């Protein structure tokens, strides 16, 4: 007649495990949480969304935070340009020092929606010609 509905929703958290089925949960289910790309949980504790008593799933705090891109690092013989922030979905432009020609790329992308905070194309080259 009732059963547990669309489970609890946290600031960036969403169920990881095929615990769910997410159809009709009978009251009494401990489920586990997954943070979205570019998020970190709280200090990583009891990740327990129980279907409690009153189809009112149990505790729900803030099991996420955020993981933004941690700087594309530094290129070489030259330097790397950050227009004021390297968050998720960002990017840079490579600029070599004097006398050199960029032989690798003139940009690279911050993407998190694949393998967590990571960048596409690391060190190009700066080849003096």
Place of tokens 């700087």: 71
DSSP letter, residue 57? -
Domain locations along the chain? 1-70, 71-129
Measure the N-to-C terminal CA separation of the chain; round to a whole number of Å: 76
Q: Taking Cα atoms as reference points, which of 33, 90, 40, 85 lies closest to residue 67?
A: 40
Beta-carbon contacts of residue 81 (< 8 Å; ≥ 6 apart): 92, 93, 94, 95
Class of domain 71-129: mainly beta
Residue 111 pairs in a beta bridge with: 118
What is 1-70's CATH number, 3.40.50.720, 3.40.50.2300, 3.40.50.300, 2.10.70.10? 2.10.70.10
Structure tokens at 88: 């998720």
Domains 1-70 and 71-129 alike in fold: yes
Other C-beta atoms lying within 10 Å of the C-beta of residue 117: 18
Residue 52: strand, helix, or coil: coil
């Amino acid at each position: 007649f009732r059963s547990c509905e669309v489970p609890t929703r946290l600031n960036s958290a969403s169920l990881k495990q095929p615990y769910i089925t997410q159809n009709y949960f009978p009251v009494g289910t401990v489920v586990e949480y997954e943070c979205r790309p570019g998020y970190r949980r709280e200090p990583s504790l009891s990740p327990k969304l129980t279907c409690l008593q009153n189809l009112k799933w149990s505790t729900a705090v803030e099991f996420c935070k955020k993981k933004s891109c941690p700087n594309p690092g530094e290129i070489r013989n030259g330097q790397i340009d950050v227009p004021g922030g390297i968050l998720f979905g960002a990017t840079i432009s490579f600029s070599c020092n004097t006398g050199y020609k960029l032989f690798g790329s003139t940009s690279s992308f911050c993407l998190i929606s694949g393998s967590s905070v990571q960048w596409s194309d690391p060190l190009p080259e700066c080849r003096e010609h």
